[model samples]
Target chain A: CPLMVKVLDAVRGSPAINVAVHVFRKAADDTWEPFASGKTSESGELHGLTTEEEFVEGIYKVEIDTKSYWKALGISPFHEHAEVVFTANDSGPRRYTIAALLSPYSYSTMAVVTN
Target chain B: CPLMVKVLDAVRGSPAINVAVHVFRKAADDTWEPFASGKTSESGELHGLTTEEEFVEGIYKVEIDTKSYWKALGISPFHEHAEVVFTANDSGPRRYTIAALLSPYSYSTMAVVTN
Candidate 1:
């Protein structure tokens, strides 16, 4: 399947979150692999499109750099950082999208592509 | 890990794309499980927050409903639909974000969040 994801631009705070992004894939033996990497903009926004949208029918994990983000903001992270993991396969729908909204200090994310 | 995902609010289309979303995860023995599900907003947006975010560290699948989206707009799908498969594990960073931007007929997704 094709996936579309976005990180909103920061509209608050002077210092911003400098985040690093990573994409992973679950293997046949029930393991994960590093698939992609990137960073969020200074405005705290990031846009991503899977160059490889298809998987061998399994699970995936998306990891972010929360430590740096907190450091950039000069504040202690409540949880050090956070990661969002998900799954993909053939038995489900067709297209999907996920969006995220984060402040210089706090963050939140959810899926809203299918209307 | 806790997961939070979002789908943006649709700004165009009168009867916007009606999309259905599904989340799948790779299993312990190299398979997947029907993890979570939701629907996009009337504005073509969906939000996802994994009630349970920890996986065994494997691949995940995210499927979208493009057929009905196109049909509702009186258009044919370029593809039956689209799906994105990715992996997860302890090797990557901690937090991450995925996002997507979709129009009346087109869609895309990627990992963003580490900033």
Candidate 2:
């Protein structure tokens, strides 16, 4: 796989389970077309979002439905959603792991890429 | 001040200096109105982005120009920009420090809020 995601709940200090993640690839016409989508497993991970062969050089966006995630826990979140947009596979194929820490009123997104 | 920012370069593992940060407040009309703006100091921090009184209970957004920061270092980054959005002081007066870790192809944002 070329892309994966790991999410954590900052308030509970535990893995954030069942968070929805959607992946979109930027089309040549400058529109974000859906590529892949999944929800985090019990371990707070979404694997196999894409394979290296499918993830070519282009701009990509990852949207995390954070508001629903926190609301399900009986908390009102601050942001409508958390999004990460970036260009991918430009220098060559690389593995990416996006890690997000979420709170009711805050969230942090980090990415670890390896060759 | 109620808000501060700290940015780190994940590639170099050092403070990201002189990165521009803009702050916006959400108005009743659902528009983001500009509030304040500044750049990271040599220590990779922006202090006094807004005062506690001025930063009332409302939705706010923090935009970090990560692309320019990485490009200045001779690296092509992935994200066009990084943004942090959330509500502040809803439960009461609090302080917020947003910390970011940045790489050419990745970035992470975290926040510590205290009463």
Candidate 3:
């Protein structure tokens, strides 16, 4: 249906809940065009950045804002941010998914394109 | 001399170059008081808060703003922020060290009491 973005807490091995996120697509002029903004659910998931119903074949950027989440828990933050940048091409997949595994000082992300 | 806080990229197993951070302490009214603001250096480190030159023996908090760091890298972020909170007591380490290991989806942290 649409692109999916998932967040996980690697330290706790659970879904990251209620994280603020921003999505952007690179425009032809090398500028970051805001595409979407939202927060993750308790399941740590957000879907559908572009409503095009298909990949736009451009550079896409996702930013995860971790400050508020950590603040609520009263913990010190080591890493202030986590970002994933990738390309959506004309022939990748009918759908796409990006996932991030996060901790205070380290994080990992992966993207999958599906037909 | 002062409390030391270090940031590391668990995914990269290296220092987090630059990241913004805020420190706060709980007041008598149970409010967060802004104590200090700064960013990590190339080595991903910040120290010295509460110019009291000593841990003020109260509840303290730290917030790491991660969105900007991830945005600058042109990557999508999954976790939006990180935080740490603890009590500074009358008797504890003369110096304290808090360290964090971070990734896109996961992170780890540790605090030490030193003589």
Q: What share of the true interface contacts does candidate 3 keep?
A: 0.04
Residue A13, candidate 2: how far off, in angstroms?
A: 7.2
Worst 10 residues of 1 chain A by lDDT: A9-18
Candidate that would win on lDDT: 2
Please provide, for model 1 over B69-98, each residue's C-alpha lDDT reduced to its tens digit, 9 standing for 90 to 100.
Answer: 556767644333434455544454444444
For every model in order, the fraction of real contacts preserved is 0.00, 0.50, 0.04
TM-score of 2: 0.72
After aligning candidate 2 to the native by TM-score, how far in Å is the CA of A26 from where it should be?
Answer: 6.3
Best-to-worst DockQ order: 2, 3, 1
Report, for every candidate in turn, its global Cα lDDT versus the true structure: 0.53, 0.85, 0.69
TM values, all candidates = 0.41, 0.72, 0.50
Query: In order, how many clashes per candidate?
Result: 69, 4, 45
The C-alpha RMSD in Å for every predicted model, in order, reads 11.6, 3.9, 8.9
Q: Order of all candidates by lDDT, from best down to worst?
A: 2, 3, 1
What does candidate 3's lDDT look like per residue over B52-95, in tens digits? Answer: 45457776777776656667777655445656665665464566
Q: Is candidate 1 or candidate 2 better by TM-score?
A: 2
Q: Put down candidate 2 lDDT per residue, A1-115, tens digits, no spaces.
A: 8899999998888899999999999898887899999999999999989887898888888889898999999987667678888778647547888888887766677778877
What local lDDT does model 3 show for residue B102?
65
